[PDB]
Amino acid sequence: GLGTARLQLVEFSAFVEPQRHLFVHISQLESVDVRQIYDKFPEKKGGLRELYDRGPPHAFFLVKFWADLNWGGFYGVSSQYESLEHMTLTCSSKVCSFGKQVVEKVETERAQLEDGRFVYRLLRSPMCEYLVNFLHKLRQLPERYMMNSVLENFTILQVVTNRDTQELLLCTAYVFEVSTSERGAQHHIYRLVR
Known about the structure:
Elements: E1 8-17, E2 21-27, E3 31-33, H1 48-54, E4 60-68, E5 74-83, E6 88-97, E7 100-110, E8 112-114, E9 117-126, H2 129-138, H3 144-151, E10 154-162, E11 168-179, E12 186-193
Parallel strand pairs: 3-12, 4-11
Antiparallel strand pairs: 1-2, 1-5, 4-12, 5-9, 6-7, 6-10, 8-9, 10-11
């Protein structure tokens, strides 16, 4: 699964409300050389290389999404994390185009005790205007292969840190293709090694 002993991703979804439609969804391992995707993110500071250098290596994951782009509504992102230790999470999400940052969103969420464990709920976070706009354009493409061509240069990098200790808890890279309405959204989680 996606997580470490200190922090685990439990659920992740991006959606639009008029019942919801899920572009992508993760509800809850093969390897990928991290060097092979350095160019899909900023190569200098806070680039994947530098983060992997500081470590820890076991906190690094790659997720490939096959998004479902078949649906003025509310565009939102929901995330839920869990842990056994009480912490405050700093969640950084960097949207990248052609390997360059076009959006950085930073949120904070404190632990909530529930069922004998700590939960971190970042629900219904409004999707950034750039993504909403991008989705609106993307879905107008006449062919799925054209969507995949455009999505080739679109990546997201999520960094979750312990706000107090500044320790890296979880770093996840996202890459994207499109899936048919018939098949529905899907994902493949990888471990990033070096």
